Amino acid sequence: GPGSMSINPFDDDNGSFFVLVNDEEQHSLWPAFADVPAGWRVVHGEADRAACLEYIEEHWPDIRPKSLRDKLATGRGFDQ
């Protein structure tokens, strides 16, 4: 798992917008209404426009190098 398997977030609540990378150095967005195809890595899942603004304004800080077996459970969503 390249790049983001586990992030070190200050708050983790609002997080950021959503970004899909790939082992082949590919990077784009992913269909939130579907499952991410194998070979890709989702570094950030869907979030609010606020989180969108955070991502774009930060223009991507860093990939947060933390490669692990698995940590990518579909649990991003507390109250909504």
Q: Which method was it determined by?
A: NMR
CA distance 42 to 48: 16
Are 20 and 42 contacting, i.e. CB atoms less than 8 angstroms apart?
A: yes
Number of domains in the chain: 1
In the beta sheet, which residues pair with residue 42? 20
Cα 53 to its chain centre, rounded Å, is 15
3-state secondary structure of 52: helix
Cα 42 to Cα 10: distance, rounded to the nearest angstrom: 19
* 40-44, strands of its sheet edge to edge: 27-28, 19-22, 40-44
Which residue range is the domain that position 25 belongs to? 1-80
Burial of 63 (C-beta count, 10 Å sphere; 0-12/13-18/19+): middle
**How distant is the alpha carbon of residue 26 from its chain centre?**
14
